[PDB]
Design a protein around this ligand. Sequence first.
Ligand SMILES: COc1ccc2cc3[n+](cc2c1OC)CCc1cc2c(cc1-3)OCO2
Ligand SMILES: COc1ccc2cc3[n+](cc2c1OC)CCc1cc2c(cc1-3)OCO2
Lengths: 277, 277
Amino acid sequence: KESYYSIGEVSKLANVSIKALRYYDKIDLFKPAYVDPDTSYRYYTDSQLIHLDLIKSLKYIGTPLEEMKKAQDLEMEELFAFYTEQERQIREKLDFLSALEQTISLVKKRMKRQMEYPALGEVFVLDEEEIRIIQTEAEGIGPENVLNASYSKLKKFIESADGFTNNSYGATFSFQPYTSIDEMTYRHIFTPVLTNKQISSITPDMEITTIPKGRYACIAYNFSPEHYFLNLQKLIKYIADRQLTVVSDVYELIIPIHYSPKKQEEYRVEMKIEILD
Amino acid sequence: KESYYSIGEVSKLANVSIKALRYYDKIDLFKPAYVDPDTSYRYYTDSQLIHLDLIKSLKYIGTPLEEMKKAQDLEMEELFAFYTEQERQIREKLDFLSALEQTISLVKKRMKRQMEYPALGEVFVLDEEEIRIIQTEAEGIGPENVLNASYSKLKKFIESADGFTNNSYGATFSFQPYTSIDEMTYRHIFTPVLTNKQISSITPDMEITTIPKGRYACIAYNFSPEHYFLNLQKLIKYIADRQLTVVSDVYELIIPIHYSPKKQEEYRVEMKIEILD
DNA sequence: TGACCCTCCCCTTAGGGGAGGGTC
DNA sequence: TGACCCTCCCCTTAGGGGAGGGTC
Ligand SMILES: COc1ccc2cc3[n+](cc2c1OC)CCc1cc2c(cc1-3)OCO2
Ligand SMILES: COc1ccc2cc3[n+](cc2c1OC)CCc1cc2c(cc1-3)OCO2
C-alpha cells in the first residue's frame, strides 16, 4: 500500500464513525499518519488500521478511552493480566445484576400478594410464610406519633444490603382489648428485609428477627384515620367470637399505594396476628 | 409532625446528598413542600419523605431520572409491570456480560498458548484442537500484497457476533516446494471466530469452516520479511526429511505483539500444516 | 459566632447533530 | 459539480466541587 486512506475510507473499513475517528485523533489515541498541511484532511496508512483492533475491542468491553492509552503500550505479556482484571470487573457487574434481579422478583412477589388480597375491611385467617425483618424498639412511639423519620436507621440498613429500600413500614403492639387509639403504644417498629445478604455489621439496637410462619388472623384496608381503630376492633372481636388464642403481637404493615407528589396520598394497611386453633 | 425538615436533615435522614436534593428539586422530581420566600431555604414535610423511597430504589436499578417521573404516577398496578420491564433489561445486561466474560476467557486462552510456545524458528509436530474460522477466497491476494483492509468484510462479521474483533489474521496456500515468495498465492484469507453465536445472516462469499483437529507440523516466529520464506523452507524440508504426508493447505496466522503507535510494529507468525504419520 | 443553606459557575464520557465553508 | 472533509459550536446524565455571600 503506497497510498493513504481518507477518513471516510477508514470509517467504512473499520466500522468506526468519522466523528469517532476525529475524536480518537484529538484524544491522541489514534492519530492519522499524515495530515495535509493545507486542507487539514486526515490520511491513514493501511498498516495503521491494526491499532483500531485493540481500541474497538476494549471499547466493546467498556474500557474508558484514556484507560486504553496505557493498554496499547503493554506487550501481550501484561495485556493478558489487563484482561484478567477486566474479567474481575465483569463478574462484579454480574453478581450485582443477579442480586438485583432476585431483589426485583421479590419486590414483585410481595407486590402481587397485596394486589390479590381476599377482601378489604373483612377479617380472615390464612396460612402465611415467614417474613424476615429488622426491628428496633419503639421508645414510646405509638400510632399517633410515628414518623417516616422514625424508620431512618432501619432503612439505612436494608438499603445497604438490598440497594432497594423497604416497600412497607411496620410496627407491633401488645394484643389488648383497647378502647382507644391513645391507649396504644408500639413495642417495635420494623422494616422487612429482601436480601438476607449478611447485614453489614449491624448495631445491637437492632434485632434481626422474623414474623414466623403460621396461621394469622388478618385484615387489610386502605388507610383512613377513622378506620384504623374500627378495623383493629373487628380483629379483636373476631378473635373473641371464635375463641382463638393469640400467640404474637399484632403485626402492623403500612405500604403506600403510590409515590406521586401530585395525587392525594393513600396507604394500604394490614394487621395480622398469629393464632392457634 | 407540625414542623419541617431542613435540606440537611432530609439528607441525613434519607441518605441522599444535599446536592442530589437540590437537583431533584430543579428537575421537578422531588420539590420541598415549602421554600422560604426570602432565604430561599428548602423545607420538607415528614410525610413527603416517602416519595424518596421510589426515587432511591429506581436509582439503584439505574432508571433515568426523567423516567422516574412517569413511574411515580402509576399506582402499584402498573408499577408492577414497570418492574417486569426492568427485569427484562436486567437479564439483557446479564446475557451480554456472561457472553462478554466467555469471550475474554477465550481471548486469554489463545493469548496464553502463543505465550507458552515451545520454541521460535524451530519446527515441531503437535496435536491441535480444532479452530473455527470464517474465510473468503483470496482473489489473487498473496504474501506480498495482502492488506489489513483485505480483512474488512471478514472482520465486520466476527465483530457483530463477538463484539471483540479477531486477534489474528489468517491465510492459506497450497503446500508446494516453492523456490520463491513471488511464486506464492493465497487460496483463502481468514479470521478465527470466538463466539459460535449464530453468525448474523452470513453472505455466501464467506464460508464458516474450520482448521480441523489433528497433528500439525508447525513453526512460529517473530516476523521479518527475510525470515518468512526461510521458515516456510524449514517446514517444507522438515516434512520431506521425515517423509510426512501433508493433508491440508499451509495455515498462516499473523498476530500483532502490541498495538502501540509509539513502538515499532512487530508480529507473531505461525505456520502449521496437518500431517499424517 | 459557627454550622447550615443558597445561587452561580466550571467540570466530567464519548462523541452525534448540525452549520458554514472549502475540497478530490 | 456533487460527494467528501474540516472546524466550530451546542447538547447530553446526574450531580460533585468549590466560591462568594447571607443565615438558624
Ligand atoms: C408513610 O408511612 C405512614 C403514613 C401515615 C401513617 C398514619 C398513621 N400511622 C402510621 C402511618 C405511617 O407509618 C409508617 C399509625 C396509625 C394511625 C392512627 C391514626 C391516624 C394516623 C395513623 O390518625 C388518627 O388515628
Ligand atoms: C497486521 O497484519 C499484517 C502485517 C504485516 C504483514 C506482512 C507480510 N504478510 C502479511 C502481513 C499481515 O497479514 C494479516 C504476508 C507474508 C509477507 C512476506 C514478505 C513481506 C511481508 C509479508 O515482505 C517481503 O516478504
